DNA sequence: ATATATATATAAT
DNA sequence: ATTATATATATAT
């Protein structure tokens, strides 16, 4: 069924009437807690994810500055061909970043910008389907058609047919991948027919712009007109409009945040993998927590509280945050909450609004603190809004001693610098409306209205310290925080990046850890675990050493055939490669 | 004159039937006796004839012309020419035989099971002569099916057939298979150029001579005499000896005469010894020395460095970084401050040399390696380097001093 | 419209070899020369001048043997007077006699000039003998020209061919370059004003360039800089040492910048008118490729001849020795090594195995490593050599 | 010793049998989490010591009982990514033809998947670290298969250096979810072909 | 005249009705097929040998004598097929040819294979077994496997040139090359009743060809050309005419091509010989040969050679295959091997 | 559409 | 540089 002298084993449900399919979310229901809770959690997951994808793509759209220069260049170089040799082909060298994954949207976004403004014919080529000159031209003519042995005279005949004015734009996504031969051929043939075929080439370059010199020699690089165009800034904006806004209900803990930021800065810049990271965390949060249906918009969340199952009411009672909250109260209030589920329902609806109004209070004070912070030189806490968010979410900032040196530095600011700072801080309050901090907006305007400098300045310093003590506080000290929060640090970390080699290295050296049956404390091991530890290699002597060990642990030849299998198992793994200096001499681990 | 230029441009360029045969008489006899025997009787024979320019297409065309003048022959003989450069497959070759025998209407849409059945129906609808020009490329087909089917139909079938074979290969009977060899009558005709230099001098007079059917006789008399006076001159004989020392082929001589005639007009009616001397200089030109004269100054400075590398580290390939490092000592120490150019320009000078193919890759791998640090070999010999520097128009003084040292 | 300057004797060789229309010329001429010595220009103007029906074909353009044959066939059918299709070389020769038997073309010498002939050999083995012997094959009074930049002995096939008569277009000398450049004047200035500009321009630029195409382009761009002191009024046309002193240092920056195409010609016209783990692994391979294995133990535990291929087990050992922390061997850090390969900063050699194929090289320059080392505050110099 | 000896030599006793009989159920808990995460655009590779084919075949019997699934064995000596493409393009589509390219065939597969959402295919790969499938082009074909929405993939890698066959662009094509599944059963079927090539 | 009937007899196409010297094999093939035709049973045969033995003519005499026996009602009648491997365009076309020969219907090759498999007194003949080979070897295998079936009633005869062929497929009757006595018998046999040759010429031709190869066609062509060269000298065909003919068809023209060469190519060959003496290898780059050749042209007194002319000399010498050279796209790296032996070159250049 | 031969690319020697 | 395998096109079934 899976084993024959062939590599294809497909099974088909033909000749039986099972054409009806199984709908999705039937596999979501792995533990039977409530049947109807799961459907609502999957709906809330889908809604929150499509909102975060839309506000990702719109923000990436806004971060228009680059396209304005390129559209102007496209029109300017074609203004020469409008007038009318040895014309150089004008080319644009867009330096896209190391984030290879991000280029698809960046090249995808540029298509409709150019298609609406300057040209109607824009096409895309990739090296994967262009090995030679027959394939590089056949893909080009087909994409040109909708927007026989075809040649460059086929291109010129098509162009005269459909125009009877505009340039044709051809963009190469990955110039690293293209072969040297086809690039050198295409430039020369196109230049001699520039009179009846106007071509402008854009190259997607990933590395620094010296890659043009290596691939293209000087005899071809003078037939072009190279003009240059041009992740840290993109990540800070997308963190603000997905997590530092109150529009999205879902949040993440500091350790979940620490995992996702560390894969970005340390391994590889990729904002799409960050998008991948929170999408798993939203999936895992509505899976592990049953009462995570409350992680939605606040009028809907209070509506969800009204209609529940009785097990859900017991599930609310057993949160550690809830248990800490009932303990601090009076004697009578505890037996009021634990017994009657209706009295529990009204208390929870208050506490989710206490949860919600806090998060309206929280970030709109963090935004004001950054306006002080980014103004200050030497940047102690951090210069970015992502860095400042991390240090206060982990613990209260003033309880750390790093914030006191910030306060000492903040006292030493001149008159002019404070006028910039309190201008911006008042602007932040106006920007986010329906804010729950009214008296503060007035007094920041009163301090602006006031303009013995040193005595009023200390009030301006003591403005910010009391404000952040009121509102900046880590959410582990708030009840029912778990309804919109997720802290499974190792669960997210290993799923994104794990280490297969240490999974190999630990298991072979320590059989006991996955068979906790006194298999090792500091002979008796499975067959791969004996031959491994012997070497860390002539095969005759290596057979003897195994024959020494395994007979001690346990006309047969049982021991020799074990040495045959548990070395051929090992050479299937990345350890053993045979050589001719001896019968065997190899050491590929050395670690 | 117009008609003299017309006749010898047809004689030397578009090589034409002319009566003269030098030193191929017994060869002409064997070929003529064979085609006479095959054309008249039911006998069939096969021939493999000589290096390039040795008159292979000359000798057969005269023989078929001579045969065709027989009144009985011309009524009842059909010819088929096939060249080994045009028809590289048997499917292309089979189509030509139906077309040239004018049987393309006869065959029509009839389907034949085998290659031989197609050829059998053609022959059965009067002897037929096959001429197979440039034969050694027919013998590099897949299974030599056209070679076997022509010999087998000759050796067995009643229909008289001649297979004359024209090649340049002396080892021609080692590329054919065993079974075609057994059906091939091993009849070798050798048009090798077995004639001496005094015989070479006589041919020089005769090919550069106007025929006797020329109308204006008085110019034809003095033109023929003027050839006779120049043919005995010592001046023409030294350059005729140089070309005879290179090759005994007459096509090289027909190259020589056309360029000497190029300088004859109404203002210069008769040829001069200077004209044949000037004709010799153009054919004897050395190609690689001419290129080095036209290189840039900086491009000369690289190759002298590349010369200097192969005398120390002998027969070992070198890259650009081998070359640029050697160039740096000459600019900073040996010569002077000028020519201490930057690294991006010297790249162009190297990249222009490889475009001209004076330098060849030891291993060709595009994309695997950089523009620099690619192992490269000089294709220019040390003898051509020193001579070309002497004839360089304004070579700088210390650059030539570096070349010797 | 078009004039050939300092090409008189070579041209006279061409119309001498051509002769009158009924005469039979050479079957094949092979013209070889440098990057600009009037190969295209002289031949094309000379064929157009005499009204000889001729076809000019670029070989690089037609990358397929097929593409090249109808391109000759269609252009000749325009000359005599819909679409003729031929696949192999045999059908080309049969149809070529069919098109040439028209009344205008029955008694004339038809020419097929071919440009960029160094690519025709790569197409097919039997194409190059086919054109050289074309007059004997077609028997239609044909001459075929070969424009190329490579000498003839490289073109020669192994099995031999008809030999073409070899011409040479001689290089332009320093005076010969001067007369061509000082012909297309700018009308507003004098004739001797433009010649002195050419005199000083070839003063700097003859050493690195004898190409006509490059120097004419360099002559156009620096001409506004040369003629601005007389426009301002500081100098005059007879103040030559004023004019040459303004362009003197300006041209020694053109050679580094405009000549190497760093700053483009469009910019140069306007300029005078305006008046973490990835960072270690690349350092690790650079220590892997460019160091001997014998001294590996000395540097870590306690450039010419190019890269040397190294095993991955050497590579990972160096990486843990320079990062002053515990590093887990995660999937990403093994994924990050082959991200550099696809970005061409690294390259694998051999390709014997992939996961058990340890071979790689660090294909990047010295300067690119020293800034990344400076970024993370690491000293690449200390480990390279003593 | 000759390879024929092992077939009669089936008398080996596991020493710690009771405790390994406990880690099949605990990793059977993780079946439904995997079966969740396949549907939503992620992929699974199992990283560990032992032979993960036992847990993989245990996954098939429990879960994929009403689906058009495929099982790929890289440890088979005569296996290719060509074979992996041919299984789908002749049997899954019920098409009966040949294709000019591996790329053209891959395009016909991806376009036919894009046309219709009714198809769901499960691409099981027992061993992706075998030297036939080690190729960056083969992994590129598998990643262009894997990026779609209506196809699912479980994999297992045995090699010590196995992530060499994914760069940043391929770690984006496969949406990998990494799982510690270290059973201690020995490689039986896949060591069989390798036992031949030494003594 | 007298000689014209010698040309008529000596022609290869004039196969005799009774073949000399192949009578035992005729009887053995005849007994094998009569032991399989009369009892209506299916068998297989394989015949091999050198190409000049006379396989097709003898088996054609066999099939003719069975046809004559069939006309005389001695055996039950049989329909006959003959196919040759070289004549066919494609290896798979055997099935469509057997199909049209046996039945009126024509089809494609795989349909013909299925119809022939379902169909199986027919007497198959398959010459040239070598070219029907495929990497499947399906055609060869089912060619052997079809007649061995009670439904088939087929006898297969096979002809090939290597005797060790039908083992690699996973009886072998053999034909021997002719010797002195059989060949001399054949040569007298065709001219039994015409007084045109002397027997000394017959024995010299027979001895020479049987010493070299052992073929019949070679003998008939050397005798037919010997009659020609005798006809030039005008009778009787003497020893001198046949001695001139035998070295007009067996002598190699490599050395006489070396004799009539020009001065510089002979100097080039002497340079090759000297460079091989200096090195001792069979491999020498074009630079190494040219570095000796300039010294030779210096010492002889020729003008100094340019390398773009010596390249033409080397290409002309390679084109006639006196040398083995690479294609000239690389220059100064052309490693040359002498295609001819050093002793022949030293024999040709000495005079 | 299947199969095979030839051309070109990639890989191993 | 050559030879072997994979692949791309062309041709025959
Ligand atoms: N012995 C000779 N007698 C008369 N003319 C000769 C002789 N040798 C050479 N020629 C002339 O030299 C030319 C030889 O070239 P020809 O076209 O006859 O065929 P070829 O070049 O020898 O054959 P291939 O083209 O196959 O190499 C002819 O023009 C012929 O007139
Ligand atoms: N005698 C001349 N008079 C005027 N201009 C000339 C002359 N010769 C060449 N040129 C100019 O030089 C330029 C380049 O010449 P050409 O096109 O012949 O280069 P090329 O040698 O064909 O280039 P390549 O070597 O790359 O094929 C032409 O644009 C032409 O205008
Ligand atoms: K998936
Ligand atoms: Mg000829
Ligand atoms: Mg040109
Ligand atoms: Mg036979």
SSE pattern of chain B, N- to C-terminal? HHEHHEHHHEHEHEHHHHHHHHHEEHH
- Beta fraction of chain A: 5-15%
Instruction: Report, as a whole number of angstroms, the end-to-end distance of chain A.
Output: 41 Å
CATH architecture of the domain at 2-190 in chain B: 3-Layer(aba) Sandwich
CATH class of the domain at 2-190 in chain B: Alpha Beta
Number of helices of chain A: 26
Radius of gyration of chain B: 30 Å
How large a portion of the residues of chain B is in β-strands, by DSSP E?
A: 5-15%
Structural category of chain A is: mainly alpha
Identify the biggest protein-protein contact and residues per side.
A-D, 75 and 79 residues
Give a short account of the largest sheet of chain B: 5 strands, parallel
Organism (chain C): Homo sapiens
Pfam families (chain C): AAA_16 (PF13191), ORC5_C (PF14630), ORC5_lid (PF21639)
Family (chain C): Belongs to the ORC5 family.
Protein name (chain C): Origin recognition complex subunit 5
Please provide a brief summary of the model:
By secondary structure, chain C is of the alpha/beta class. Chain C has helices at residues 9-18, 40-49, 65-80, 89-100, 120-123, 127-132, 134-138, 152-155, 174-181, 191-205, 212-226, 228-232, 240-254, 265-273, 277-289, 296-300, 312-322, 331-342, 366-375, 380-384, and strands spanning 28-32, 54-58, 110-115, 142-148, 165-168, 346-347, 361-362. Chain C has a five-stranded parallel β-sheet with strand order 2-3-4-1-5, with helices on both faces.
């Amino acid at each position: 069924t899976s084993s024959m002298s062939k590599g294809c084993f497909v099974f088909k449900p033909n000749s039986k009437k099972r054409k009806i399919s199984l709908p999705i979310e039937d596999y979501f229901n792995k533990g039977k807690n409530e049947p109807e809770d799961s459907k609502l959690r999957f709906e809330t997951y889908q809604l929150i994810w499509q909102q975060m994808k839309s506000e990702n793509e719109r923000l990436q759209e806004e971060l228009k500055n680059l396209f304005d220069n390129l559209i102007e260049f496209l029109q300017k170089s074609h203004s020469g061909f409008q007038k009318n040799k040895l014309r150089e082909i004008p080319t644009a060298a867009l330096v896209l970043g190391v984030n290879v994954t991000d280029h698809d949207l960046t090249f995808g976004s540029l298509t409709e910008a150019l298609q609406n403004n300057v040209t109607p014919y824009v096409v895309s080529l990739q090296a994967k389907d262009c090995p030679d000159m027959k394939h590089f031209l056949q893909k080009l003519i087909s994409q040109l058609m909708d927007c026989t042995h075809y040649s460059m005279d086929s291109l010129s005949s098509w162009y005269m047919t459909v125009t009877q004015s505009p340039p044709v734009v051809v963009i190469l996504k990955d110039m690293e991948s293209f072969a040297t031969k086809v690039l050198q051929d295409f430039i020369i043939i196109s230049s001699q027919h520039l009179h009846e075929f106007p071509l402008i080439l854009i190259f997607g370059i990933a590395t620094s712009p010296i890659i043009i010199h290596r691939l293209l020699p000087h005899a071809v690089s003078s037939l072009l007109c190279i003009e240059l165009f041009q992740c840290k800034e993109h990540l800070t904006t997308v963190l603000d409009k997905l997590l530092l806004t109150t529009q999205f209900p879902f949040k993440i803990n500091e350790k979940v945040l620490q995992v996702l930021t560390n894969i970005f800065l340390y391994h590889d810049f990729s904002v799409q993998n960050f998008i991948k990271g929170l999408q798993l965390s939203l999936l895992e949060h509505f899976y592990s927590q049953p009462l995570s249906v409350l992680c939605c918009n606040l009028p809907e969340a209070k509506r969800r509280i009204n209609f529940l199952s009785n097990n859900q009411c017991e599930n609310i009672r057993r949160l550690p945050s809830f248990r800490r909250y009932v303990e601090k109260q009076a004697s009578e209030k505890q037996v009021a909450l634990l017994t009657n589920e209706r009295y529990l329902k009204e208390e929870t609806q208050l506490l989710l609004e206490n949860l919600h109004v806090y998060h309206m209070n929280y970030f709109l004070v963090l935004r004001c603190l950054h306006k002080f912070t980014s103004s200050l030189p030497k940047y102690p806490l951090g210069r970015q809004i992502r860095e400042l968010y991390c240090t206060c979410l982990e613990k209260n900032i003033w309880d750390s001693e790093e914030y006191a040196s910030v306060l000492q530095l903040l006292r030493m600011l001149a008159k002019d610098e404070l006028m910039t700072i309190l201008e911006k801080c008042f602007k932040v309050f106006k920007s986010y409306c329906e804010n729950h901090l009214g008296s503060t907006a007035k007094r920041i305007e009163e301090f602006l209205a006031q303009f013995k400098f040193e005595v009023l300045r200390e009030n301006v310093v003591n403005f910010i310290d009391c404000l952040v003590r009121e509102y900046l506080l880590p959410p582990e000290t708030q009840p029912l925080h778990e309804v919109v929060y997720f802290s499974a640090a190792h669960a997210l970390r290993e799923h994104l990046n794990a280490a297969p080699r240490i999974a190999l290295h630990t298991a072979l050296n320590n059989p006991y850890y996955y068979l906790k049956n006194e298999a090792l404390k500091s002979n008796i091991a499975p067959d791969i675990c004996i031959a491994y530890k012997l070497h860390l290699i002539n095969l005759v002597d290596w057979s003897e050493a195994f024959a020494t060990v395994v007979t001690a642990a346990e006309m047969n030849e049982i021991i020799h055939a074990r040495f045959i299998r548990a070395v051929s198992e090992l050479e299937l793994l990345g350890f053993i490669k045979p050589t001719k200096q001896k019968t065997d001499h190899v050491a590929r681990l050395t670690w | 004159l117009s008609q003299v230029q017309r006749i010898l441009r047809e004689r030397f360029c578009r090589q034409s039937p002319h009566s003269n045969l030098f030193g191929v008489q017994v060869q002409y006899k064997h070929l003529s006796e064979l085609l006479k025997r095959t054309a008249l009787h039911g006998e069939s024979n096969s021939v493999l004839i000589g290096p390039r320019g040795s008159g292979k297409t000359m000798l057969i065309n005269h023989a078929l012309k001579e045969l065709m003048e027989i009144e009985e022959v011309s009524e009842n003989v059909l010819q088929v020419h096939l060249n080994g450069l045009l028809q590289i497959n048997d499917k292309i070759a089979l189509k030509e035989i139906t077309r040239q025998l004018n049987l393309e209407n006869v065959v029509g849409d009839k389907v034949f099971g085998s290659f031989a059945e197609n050829l059998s129906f053609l022959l059965e609808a009067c002897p037929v002569i096959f001429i197979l020009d440039e034969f050694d490329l027919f013998a590099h087909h897949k299974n030599q099916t056209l070679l076997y089917n022509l010999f087998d139909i000759s050796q067995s079938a009643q229909t008289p057939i001649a297979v004359i074979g024209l090649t340049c290969r002396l080892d021609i009977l080692e590329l054919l298979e065993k079974r075609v060899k057994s059906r091939f009558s091993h009849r070798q005709i050798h048009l090798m150029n077995s004639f001496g230099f005094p015989q070479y001098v006589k041919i020089f007079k005769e090919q550069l001579s106007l025929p006797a059917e020329f109308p204006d006789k008085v110019f034809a008399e003095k033109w023929n005499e003027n050839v006779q006076y120049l043919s005995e001159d010592r001046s023409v004989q030294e350059v005729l000896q140089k070309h005879f020392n290179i090759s005994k082929n007459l096509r090289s001589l027909h190259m020589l005469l056309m360029l000497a005639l190029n300088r004859v007009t109404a203002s210069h009616p008769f040829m001069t010894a200077v004209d044949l001397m000037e004709a010799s200089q153009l054919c004897s030109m050395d190609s690689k020395a001419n290129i080095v004269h036209g290189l840039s100054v900086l491009e000369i400075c690289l190759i002298i460095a590349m010369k200097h590398l192969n005398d120390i580290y002998e027969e070992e390939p070198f890259n650009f970084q081998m070359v640029y490092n050697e160039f740096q000592k000459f600019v900073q120490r040996k010569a002077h401050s000028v020519y201490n150019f930057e690294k991006p320009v010297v790249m162009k000078a190297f990249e222009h040399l490889q475009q001209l193919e004076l330098i060849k890759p030891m291993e060709r791998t595009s994309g695997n390696s950089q523009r620099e640090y690619q192992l490269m070999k000089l294709l220019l010999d040390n003898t051509q380097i020193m001579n070309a520097l002497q004839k360089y128009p304004n070579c700088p003084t210390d650059v030539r001093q570096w070349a010797t040292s | 419209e078009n004039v050939v300057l300092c090409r008189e004797s070579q041209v006279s060789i061409l119309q001498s070899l051509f002769g009158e229309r009924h005469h039979f010329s050479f079957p094949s001429i092979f013209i070889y020369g440098h990057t600009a010595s009037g190969k295209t220009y002289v031949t094309q103007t000379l064929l157009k001048t005499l009204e000889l029906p001729h076809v000019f074909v670029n070989c690089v353009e037609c990358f397929t043997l097929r593409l090249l044959l109808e391109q000759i066939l269609n252009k000749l059918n325009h000359l005599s007077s819909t679409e003729i299709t031929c696949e192999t070389f045999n059908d080309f020769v049969r149809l070529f006699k069919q098109v040439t038997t028209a009344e205008n073309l029955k008694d004339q010498t038809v020419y097929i000039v071919l440009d960029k002939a160094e690519y025709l050999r790569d197409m097919e083995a039997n194409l190059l003998p086919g054109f050289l012997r074309l007059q004997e094959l077609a028997d239609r009074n044909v001459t075929v020209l070969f424009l190329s930049e490579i000498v003839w002995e490289k073109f020669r096939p192994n099995t031999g061919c008809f030999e073409p008569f070899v011409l040479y277009f001689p290089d332009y000398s320093i005076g010969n370059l001067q007369k061509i450049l000082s012909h297309d004047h700018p009308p507003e200035y004098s004739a001797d004003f433009y010649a002195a500009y050419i005199n000083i321009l070839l003063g700097v630029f003859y050493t690195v360039c004898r190409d006509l195409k490059e120097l004419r382009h360099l002559a156009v761009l620096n001409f506004p800089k040369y003629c601005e002191p007389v426009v301002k009024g500081e100098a005059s046309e007879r103040d030559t040492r004023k004019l040459w002193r303004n362009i003197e240092p300006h041209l020694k920056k053109a050679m580094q910048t405009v000549y190497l195409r760093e700053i483009s010609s469009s910019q140069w016209e306007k300029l005078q008118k305006d008046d973490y783990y990835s960072k270690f692994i690349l350092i690790a391979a650079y220590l892997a490729s460019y160091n001997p294995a014998r001294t590996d133990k000395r540097f870590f535990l306690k450039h010419l001849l190019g890269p040397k291929p190294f095993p991955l087990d050497r590579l990972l050992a160096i990486l843990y020795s320079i990062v002053d922390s515990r590093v887990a061997p995660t999937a990403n850090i093994f994924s990050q090594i082959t991200s550099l390969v696809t970005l061409q900063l690294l390259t694998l050699v051999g390709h014997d195995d992939q996961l058990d194929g340890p071979k790689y090289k660090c294909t990047v320059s010295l300067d690119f490593i020293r800034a990344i080392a400076r970024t993370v505050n690491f000293d690449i110099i200390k480990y390279l050599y003593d | 010793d000759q390879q024929t000896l092992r077939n009669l030599l089936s008398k080996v006793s596991p020493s710690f049998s009771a405790e390994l009989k406990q880690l099949n159920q605990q990793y059977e808990k993780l079946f439904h989490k995997w079966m969740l995460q396949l549907h939503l655009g992620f992929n699974i590779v199992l990283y560990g010591l032992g032979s993960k084919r036992d847990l993989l075949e245990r996954f098939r019997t429990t879960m994929l009982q009403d689906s058009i699934h495929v099982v790929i064995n890289g440890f088979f000596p005569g296996i290719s990514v060509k074979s992996v493409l041919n299984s789908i393009t002749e049997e899954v589509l019920d098409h009966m033809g040949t294709f000019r390219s591996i790329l053209d065939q891959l395009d016909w597969i991806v376009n036919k998947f894009k046309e219709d959402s009714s198809l769901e295919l499960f691409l099981l790969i027992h061993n992706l670290d075998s030297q036939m499938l080690r190729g960056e082009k083969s992994q590129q074909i598998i990643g262009q298969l894997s990026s779609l929405h209506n196809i699912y993939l479980i994999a297992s890698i045995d090699h010590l250096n196995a992530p060499l066959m994914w760069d940043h662009a391929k770690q984006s094509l496969f949406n990998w979810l990494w799982y510690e599944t270290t059973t201690y059963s020995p490689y039986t079927e896949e060591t069989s072909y390798e036992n031949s090539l030494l003594v | 005249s007298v000689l014209e009937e010698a040309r008529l007899r000596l022609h290869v196409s004039a196969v005799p009705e009774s073949l000399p010297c192949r009578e035992q094999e005729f009887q053995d093939i005849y007994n094998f097929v009569e032991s399989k035709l009369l009892d209506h049973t299916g068998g297989c045969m394989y015949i091999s040998g050198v190409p000049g033995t006379g396989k097709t003519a003898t088996v054609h005499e066999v099939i003719r004598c069975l046809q004559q026996a069939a006309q005389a009602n001695d055996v039950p009648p049989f329909q006959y097929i003959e196919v040759n491997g070289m004549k066919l365009t494609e290896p798979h076309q055997v099935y469509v040819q057997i199909l049209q020969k046996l039945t009126g219907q024509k089809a494609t090759a795989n349909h013909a294979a299925e119809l022939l498999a379902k169909q199986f007194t027919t007497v198959l003949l398959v010459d040239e077994l070598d070219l029907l080979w495929t990497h499947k070897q399906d055609i060869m295998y089912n060619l052997f496997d079809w007649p061995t079936h009670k439904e088939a009633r087929l006898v297969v005869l096979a002809i090939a040139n290597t005797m060790d062929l039908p083992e690699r497929i996973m009886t072998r009757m053999c034909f021997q090359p002719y010797t002195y006595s059989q060949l001399q018998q054949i040569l007298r046999s065709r001219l039994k009743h015409l007084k045109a040759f002397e027997d000394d010429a017959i024995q010299l031709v027979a001895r020479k060809v049987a010493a070299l190869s052992g073929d019949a066609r070679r003998c008939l062509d050397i005798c037919r050309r010997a009659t020609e060269i005798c006809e030039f000298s005008q009778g009787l065909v003497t020893i001198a005419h046949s001695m001139e003919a035998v070295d007009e068809m067996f002598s190699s023209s490599y050395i006489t091509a070396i004799k009539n060469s020009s001065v510089l190519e002979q100097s080039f060959l002497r340079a090759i010989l000297a460079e091989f003496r200096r090195s001792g290898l069979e491999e020498a780059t074009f630079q190494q040969i040219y570095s000796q050749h300039v010294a030779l042209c210096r010492m002889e007194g020729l003008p100094y050679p340019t390398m773009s002319e010596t390249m033409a000399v080397c290409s002309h010498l390679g084109s006639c295959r006196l040398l083995l050279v690479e294609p000239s796209r690389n220059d100064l790296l052309l490693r040359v091997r002498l295609n001819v032996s050093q002793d022949d070159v030293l024999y040709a250049l000495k005079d």
